[PDB]
């Protein structure tokens, strides 16, 4: 008889389910991809019903498998984590989406952001929310929906719509109607006051959200999110949803970066570096976003973070695969062993613009330096190198904002962290010691932690921390400052070529 | 069955055509050879592979004809070839001292920069018809001299032969004749464009200390020798009677004989030539002054201005190698199905930019991609890039010729069958395009030269009617505002590619 924690990670490219035992070993896991719809230049959508169907199927297969291995199974609780910013507006009473999800990676609102940015003081927006206007957060997507679909406008006005991130969507469906979010996801909307942790009336007005009742209640990360009641997942009847957090913040909890100054970097569909700033709100002057790291309980002061976001990483590799430049993602290590340099090819991976720290939504993905000798392999390597170069820019902003000369370690996680030549190149270019987590799925691990803590599986966070801090690999820089400066100059000139106004 | 053998030793393959005396193709076949691109900038061919392929093609074709006809007589052989590509070999043994270094090779970029600084570039243009560049033979010869002491020593002692592909073919087929023709000699950077002789000052600049290693320059219709190679026994004592570089051959095959007439061939590269009559025209807009043809020794040559584009078919081949297209065949459907490029621009500068900008520092670059971009958009961008480059050349040509517009551009090549591609071309270059009826006008040109030399026909005037036949005309369907926009978008991309940072 087996107690387990279900951790759902509804990620950008796929939905993942993880069943953890109470020693935080994975006893079953699986995933299903869902369509990445890119209809037009800059558009990026998901089908919200496809996501739910995939979720239900994965939950049902998982309990079946477990009930096959074990004598009885007890699901103690459910934690939810998710791709952030992605937004769905749906009908409250029926649950019917009024439009597809518009994903974080969508950039159709470039024109709107240019328009609004000229009308508002960017420092005032940043003080309120933690960010300048951008194409990335939910708010301009919501605005676009309201401007382009009068049904949406009408139903926000009359309070018959719900505006939600993916976490809100999942909980609403599982619970048959609860409307909740958590402070980490709310901080990704451009609608929350970053200091007070409440929906901000002024921001709502800017974005034409005329009836704030359509917004879900903002909860702490460990909370009573409700009981599963969906008839699609009958074995899960009355199992409580007890933790909820945005994916990249989830990875902070899974990496145990709980002390001020500790930093992690997750390599996934995008790459996301967060540093814990303790209870102090730190506002960047270098292109980083101020966000909520976590707030476990209602009476806790939140821990804050500075975040550097990169949009093209795994999403780039996926693009390469679709367009036949790579036969399979698994090859990327072998490609980097065999292909020792790119023969000066540079790939500025800007398919959805540049995010942190330059924030140029007018950037597009660009390849430079090719000759007849250039092969697929070199193009693939150059895209991977471009991840590292972008991360280096982020690290430079972070050290400036933090008033430090270096990070002592960067804790890293993700599939790509198993690719030794890639991680070595990252360590070389960012000039930072990198410690790779033992767990790669640290996102799902953080959600299982929060859910378990909420139902007292363990007494305290302190009983799980030594477990969490485990590492299996370390990288140090092996690259000369001469060589590094030369490579970073090459990158910098290719970014200039990509950005110059002509 | 009396036939003319026309050999087209092209960049990517070797083709043989047997023509009857009415210029009908009775048999043809081809074989590819390796495009060796070992390092960035490097582009080589195996000279022995080319010869082996040609002998197999010749032997198979005469087997086919003698299976089909009761008696076969090969009246004569014409040779045409990829230009600029150079091979240095031992005179006695015929052994190559190094691979062919192809016209597309750009390893000499640093030397060209050095020499362009040291010498007066207008003087080089006045002498030879071109500025220093990575394209013509001479820098490649100089690189071999500087990097291979055996080549240096065999030039100095007069035991090597320095030859373009025509010279190489004729040397092997004849067991030793060392000949070139006027058109190929003009592609070396070593010939005086006015006197049509090897220039001692040029040879000095390129460290060619002994001019005896260079072949005799002949007219295009000439006695190039009799076939003697034991590898092609059935061809024993058949005369080789025409020889011309490929792009010039396409001039003959398109009947571009009058002053101001122009053609454009689409192949591995794209090459526009305009006949300037007996006048030598020096460009101020990046075009090269070349010889169009000189049939007999007595004739004043006909000159041309030429705009050369490196990445065309060579670009398609790269796309194919890198899995961005599954077969070349698909370009048309790609362009039908793909009505625009998602705003993507591909500056196809794998070996730098050739005419009219002549920037050896340029590299192939792709701009404007989003997650919506697909292979097909990138393919179509490369193809659009051909047309944008052609437009720049047409602009240079109308300036140099002192005209407002070309009346018509006669086009040939496999790409010219692709209606959406040709229509894009005609839109962007804003020039009427007339497509030749004949698909291998390069080989036709050599067949005409070879057969004229052995007097198969009364005159060139008898064959001209057949040569002029066209089957399609394109005119621009694009409005000036949309043309100006697109050309502005290309120009900004090129500027991004070229800005010195």
Author numbering:
A (entry chain C): 0 to 501
B (entry chain A): 1 to 501
The authors write:
GK catalyses the rate-limiting step of glycerol utilization, with phosphorylation serving to sequester the sugar in the cell. The 501-residue GK polypeptide is arranged as two domains separated by a deep cleft. Each domain is constructed around a βββαβαβα core that is characteristic of the sugar kinase/Hsp70/actin superfamily of proteins. In agreement with gel filtration experiments (data not shown), PfGK is a dimer in the crystal.
